[PDB]
Amino acid sequence: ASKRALVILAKGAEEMETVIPVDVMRRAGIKVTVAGLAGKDPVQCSRDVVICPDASLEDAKKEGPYDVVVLPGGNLGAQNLSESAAVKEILKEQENRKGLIAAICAGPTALLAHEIGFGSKVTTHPLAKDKMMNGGHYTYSENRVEKDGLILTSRGPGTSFEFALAIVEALNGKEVAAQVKAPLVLK
Amino acid sequence: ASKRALVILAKGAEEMETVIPVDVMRRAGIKVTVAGLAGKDPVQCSRDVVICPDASLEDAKKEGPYDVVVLPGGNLGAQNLSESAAVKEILKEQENRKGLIAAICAGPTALLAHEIGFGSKVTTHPLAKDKMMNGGHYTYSENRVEKDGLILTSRGPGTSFEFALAIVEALNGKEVAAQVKAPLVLK
Numbered sequence: 537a538s539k540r541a542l543v544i545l546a547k548g549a550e551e552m553e554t555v556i557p558v559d560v561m562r563r564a565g566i567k568v569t570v571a572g573l574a575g576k577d578p579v580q581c582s583r584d585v586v587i588c589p590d591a592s593l594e595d596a597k598k599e600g601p602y603d604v605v606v607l608p609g610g611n612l613g614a615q616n617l618s619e620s621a622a623v624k625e626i627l628k629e630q631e632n633r634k635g636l637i638a639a640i641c642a643g644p645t646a647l648l649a650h651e652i653g654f655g656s657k658v659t660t661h662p663l664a665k666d667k668m669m670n671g672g673h674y675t676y677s678e679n680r681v682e683k684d685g686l687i688l689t690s691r692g693p694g695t696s697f698e699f700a701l702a703i704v705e706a707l708n709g710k711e712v713a714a715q716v717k718a719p720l721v722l723k
Numbered sequence: 724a725s726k727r728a729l730v731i732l733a734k735g736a737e738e739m740e741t742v743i744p745v746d747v748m749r750r751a752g753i754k755v756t757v758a759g760l761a762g763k764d765p766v767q768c769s770r771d772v773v774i775c776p777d778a779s780l781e782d783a784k785k786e787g788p789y790d791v792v793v794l795p796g797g798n799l800g801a802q803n804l805s806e807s808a809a810v811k812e813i814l815k816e817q818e819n820r821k822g823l824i825a826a827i828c829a830g831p832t833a834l835l836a837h838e839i840g841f842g843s844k845v846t847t848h849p850l851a852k853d854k855m856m857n858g859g860h861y862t863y864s865e866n867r868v869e870k871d872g873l874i875l876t877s878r879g880p881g882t883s884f885e886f887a888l889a890i891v892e893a894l895n896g897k898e899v900a901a902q903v904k905a906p907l908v909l910k
């Protein structure tokens with residue numbers, strides 16, 4: 537059966553961190569739902585790229601659960617995710633069922649906000665480290681991608697391919713990840 | 724004065740190759756117009772990400788000329804660009820005024836279709852080489868980014884940051900490109 541991914545898209549999301557994982561996961565045969573935090577309408581990302589979500593988060597939640605929940609970064613996107621009761625519920629449920637949670641750049645600060653994955657080894661964008669580490673609830677890593685069990689984190693736009701391929705490997709295996717990687721012309 | 728970029732967005736464009744240069748150029752302070760080939764409506768990219776253009780190409784052309792014209796790849800996106808009389812006119816004008824033209828993945832095959840830049844050293848996605856080289860009108864390169872004068876080409880999603888930063892360097896200089904690069908967490 538095909539794996540399913542929920543990508544939560546908030547105003548101020550980093551568009552590269554949104555699009556690269558969506559595209560790469562779709563290349564891997566994953567059924568991806570781009571879910572609008574605020575509803576069904578187009579989302580203005582951090583650098584003003586406007587993406588039309590596949591569905592509202594409210595609607596996508598009804599089709600859960602998902603094999604991965606993905607949180608893009610962008611400061612303002614991550615803040616919107618961090619402030620959302622709907623996101624809290626989704627992540628709690630995902631953690632409780634031992635489903636994968638993936639977050640990049642400032643995205644992992646939403647895990648802190650929602651008390652998800654405490655004790656995990658995590659990375660973030662360098663500028664988000666102090667926020668993530670407030671209280672010492674995680675252990676910090678400078679690895680480009682950090683996977684500690686079902687908490688998968690990464691650092692920035694420039695680690696987005698690695699992040700996406702790590703998700704692919706987690707869901708569909710090493711060989712599919714390698715197959716998807718080769719046509720991308722990665723270094 | 725701020726530099727200006729026209730990114731031409733066609734149905735079936737590779738969304739990563741569209742979004743990474745738009746975002747990176749905006750980080751560099753470039754005024755970027757995402758112009759819809761087919762008009763003002765949202766564009767369904769190759770892996771089903773839907774992007775709302777800033778304007779129709781018809782409207783953006785009236786605000787030209789631009790310091791760079793950017794052609795994303797994606798096979799079907801590149802075919803749409805290759806078949807467009809409007810694109811032909813834009814590229815011819817740009818070449819005639821000695822303005823930069825940038826194309827990635829299958830994107831450079833539109834340069835062939837529109838007889839732009841013949842004699843240049845170019846790269847493409849490996850799968851687009853034979854198409855690009857039909858007639859031997861260019862010299863082929865396996866460099867991740869190839870800049871031959873005002874024709875700047877690149878290979879794939881995985882070279883999109885390098886491609887975007889090369890555009891930035893061409894328009895705004897090495898130091899701005901380095902400044903924009905550092906927060907991205909590139910390898």
Ligand SMILES: *[C@@]1(=O)C(=O)N([C][C])C2=[C][C]=[C][C]=C21
Nearest residue numbers: 550609610611641642661906
């Ligand atoms: C990234 O997308 C993000 O969330 N942040 C805030 C820390 C950031 C900063 C600089 C580049 C990329 C990102």
Ligand SMILES: *[C@@]1(=O)C(=O)N([C][C])C2=[C][C]=[C][C]=C21
Nearest residue numbers: 719737796797798828829848
């Ligand atoms: C790229 O975006 C593109 O245009 N092509 C067609 C050659 C391609 C193929 C495989 C990965 C990326 C791209």
Ligand SMILES: [Cl-]
Nearest residue numbers: 582610611612
């Ligand atoms: Cl940001």
Ligand SMILES: [Cl-]
Nearest residue numbers: 769797798799
């Ligand atoms: Cl394609």
